[PDB]
Design a protein around this ligand. Structure first.
Ligand SMILES: Cc1cc2nc3c(=O)[nH]c(=O)nc-3n(C[C@H](O)[C@H](O)[C@H](O)COP(=O)(O)OP(=O)(O)OC[C@H]3O[C@@H](n4cnc5c(N)ncnc54)[C@H](O)[C@@H]3O)c2cc1C
Ligand SMILES: Cc1cc2nc3c(=O)[nH]c(=O)nc-3n(C[C@H](O)[C@H](O)[C@H](O)COP(=O)(O)OP(=O)(O)OC[C@H]3O[C@@H](n4cnc5c(N)ncnc54)[C@H](O)[C@@H]3O)c2cc1C
Lengths: 395, 394
């Protein structure tokens, strides 16, 4: 038999595994799915638990429930490195050998060599992380009542005004009243600050949506510093440059949404990467390797319409997964492989549980309609991986 | 005038103010009650929020509801100092003058000058404090899944196996399943440690009850280090001396139930204090001062029947309150006042929602019945201070 190894159980990994599961009958191939955890988590919702608006359990599902144990063998371990030449993968407590390999380890934060960011800041990239963020913030608010001289406890800074950062501050803003009610804090003293290097909030968005969003969040007490870059980060706070002069913000909680790069494991294993990602062939496989397929954030692709790269998104990762499943199933059988054609719909961004901005159907949706739309789109994924039972289990 | 000032709205203080209000007709005297916070909190329940077993809002009640504006005037500020000679009290945002004074600012943690205890440890003495403790523990558990190498995060050390410490570890133990369930932590790796200098846990109680309690908590995964004293404290953990050698415990959370002393203001105000507390006359009044009365944890008293001192407790503080109310009313009226004789009921200690130990009525009650007994006794105070509305609201 031929042995297929899939790394990571993220969007690309899980869609690939489930697809392979559907395509192949028993004994056609040996399939192993490797993930750091026994669960796969819905990354797109991760902002919600981080704020504390939603329980983290909604964002994750157990892998054992998702798959057939006869078809796939599941491994709970951490990837340390990949060796192409030896054709083996090295894990913390194991090693594997693959006839065919699928790589979807997701992304790692991009700090752009900003001083102290990696050490002293938080990121929304996992269940553990959002848990830590949420309880961190709750802890500081708990601490405020003891010494109210220290208003830094109430200050929360988000780095980057890109998609993730804006969703997160929206959730935080919606979260704030209940939190202050819990910890006996005057709502006025709380500061939520969004700091972006770029001159505009939400680049890659129609200005109409952006200003509407700024009206909503600004109405909710959010503060925006734009054209302002983070000079450095310290346990005390952050230091930013305005009008070519240094200014210091003393904040207990600093969260970094500014940028993302591919997993370090990919670059560290001798691949060549632009921004940590690999520019793959029309069949989504690494250049010079017929036996390795790449998906999600680790993969790089460019649009025909403009010589600019497709952004790293859940949706494109899903498409990657289905395509790779099809191609692998065909390839082991000696069949013809299909090239990858990306079909891209529009994305909706939440401004809290009740509010959103989006471009869907080439239309400019706002408010409740946009929010409900986003929820429906997200439900479509749940239907995809787990079906009616999975969707019903949420709500 | 005559002007009466009460400091703090703890058990003694609030019972005192309520007592005066019940006792006196309108316009008879000027009474002002001062507290750092707009609420009075049921200290007796404070261990529960610290574990996270019970929401904190239950443990506190707003003061304004309790008293009648016209009878009493409330000031929300923090006492900074007392000047006996000038007969004045100094606050952060005010100053007050008293014909008669009542002091019940409660207690402050006693660390016995142990290195780093005040800096690096937690105490269960206020709502804010228990909130900080609870969220601290939750924070460590949240941190754990990211790095499971660090088991110190899961370790919680409690100093003292006295009444408070035992209740607290009991609550933590009952708390543990839900807590471990939330943050993806194996229940086994969790350590709860109770550390006492004394050779026995829970001194001053009949040994049978003690053995039963150790059986319960020990069954619940609680660990006891007895005859072992804490040498010093670090943010990483604590250092204790066992078998004539230093031993290092790596624990993220250290909670101190070991000792209590009177409020620092008392020592700082020119009083003469044994353990930061004052030894009062039979009328519950400060020595050398006819216009000053002391209540609660700030007060010190001795039993004739046994040459041992009365401990600082809620119930005795309440008795202080009623006594001071009656005596004060007499003093304003010019009548003869009653000396203070304390009558003591039995005390019950919880081991969680499902278990308790008590010596109420000399029956030495154990288990579930004891728990219900404690709940009823706790309800009695609520009935006293607020009436039907307060008890129903819980
Ligand atoms: C708040 C937030 C909101 C978002 N909303 C949207 C949206 O609305 N629409 C949209 O299209 N996109 C959205 N995205 C982007 C989208 O979520 C990501 O692009 C997508 O998750 C990436 O797909 P992936 O499977 O390759 O990465 P991942 O989902 O991160 O896959 C990583 C998986 O592999 C595991 N893993 C990682 N490293 C290792 C390792 N060394 N060893 C073993 N296992 C490892 C991880 O535990 C995880 O299981 C959002 C992102 C964020 C942070
Ligand atoms: C976990 C715990 C459990 C307990 N369980 C029991 C039990 O089961 N049975 C029993 O009999 N006793 C029990 N006790 C003891 C009892 O709760 C205390 O002894 C009681 O508080 C004594 O009355 P107090 O008014 O002096 O204390 P406090 O209630 O603490 O009075 C202090 C009040 O004054 C305020 N204050 C303090 N300093 C200032 C300042 N400078 N300026 C203005 N305001 C100030 C405080 O905020 C507080 O409101 C327990 C104590 C603890 C910590």
């Amino acid at each position: 038999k031929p042995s297929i190894v899939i790394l990571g159980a993220g969007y690309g990994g899980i869609v690939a595994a489930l697809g392979l599961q559907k395509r192949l009958n028993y004994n056609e191939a040996d399939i192993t799915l490797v993930n750091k955890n026994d669960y796969h988590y819905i990354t797109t919702e991760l902002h919600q638990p981080a704020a504390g608006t939603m329980h983290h359990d909604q964002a994750r599902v157990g892998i054992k429930e998702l798959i057939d144990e006869k078809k796939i063998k599941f491994v709970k371990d951490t990837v340390v490195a990949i060796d192409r030449e030896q054709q083996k993968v090295t894990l913390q407590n194991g090693e594997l050998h693959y006839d065919y390999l699928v790589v979807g380890l997701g992304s790692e934060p991009e700090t752009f060599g900003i001083e102290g960011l990696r050490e002293h800041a938080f990121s929304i990239n996992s269940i553990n992380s959002v848990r830590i963020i949420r309880q961190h913030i709750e802890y500081q608010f708990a601490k405020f009542a003891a010494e109210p001289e220290r208003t830094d406890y109430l200050t929360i800074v988000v780095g980057g005004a890109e998609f993730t950062g804006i969703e997160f501050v929206g959730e935080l803003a919606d979260r704030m009243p209940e939190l202050c009610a819990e910890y006996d804090v005057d709502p006025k003293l709380v500061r939520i600050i969004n700091v972006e290097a770029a001159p505009t909030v939400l680049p890659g968005f129609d200005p109409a949506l952006v200003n509407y969003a700024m009206d909503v969040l600004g109405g909710k007490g959010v503060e925006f510093k734009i054209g302002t870059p983070i000079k450095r980060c310290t346990p005390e706070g952050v230091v930013i440059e305005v009008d070519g002069e240094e200014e210091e913000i003393k904040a207990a909680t600093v969260v970094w949404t500014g940028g993302v790069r591919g997993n370090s494991i990919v670059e560290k294993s001798g691949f060549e990467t632009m921004r940590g990602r690999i520019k793959v062939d029309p069949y989504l496989r690494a250049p010079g390797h017929e036996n390795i397929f790449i998906v999600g954030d680790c993969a790089l692709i460019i649009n025909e319409e403009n010589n600019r790269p497709y952004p790293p998104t859940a949706q494109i990762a899903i498409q990657h997964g289905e395509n790779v499943a099809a191609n692998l199933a065909a390839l082991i059988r000696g069949g013809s492989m299909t090239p990858f054609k990306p079909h891209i719909r529009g994305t909706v961004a939440s401004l809290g549980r009740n509010d959103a901005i989006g471009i869907v159907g080439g239309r400019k949706v706002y408010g409740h309609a946009a929010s409900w739309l986003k929820k429906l789109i997200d439900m479509r994924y749940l239907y995809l991986i787990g079906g009616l039972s999975l969707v019903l289990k949420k709500g």
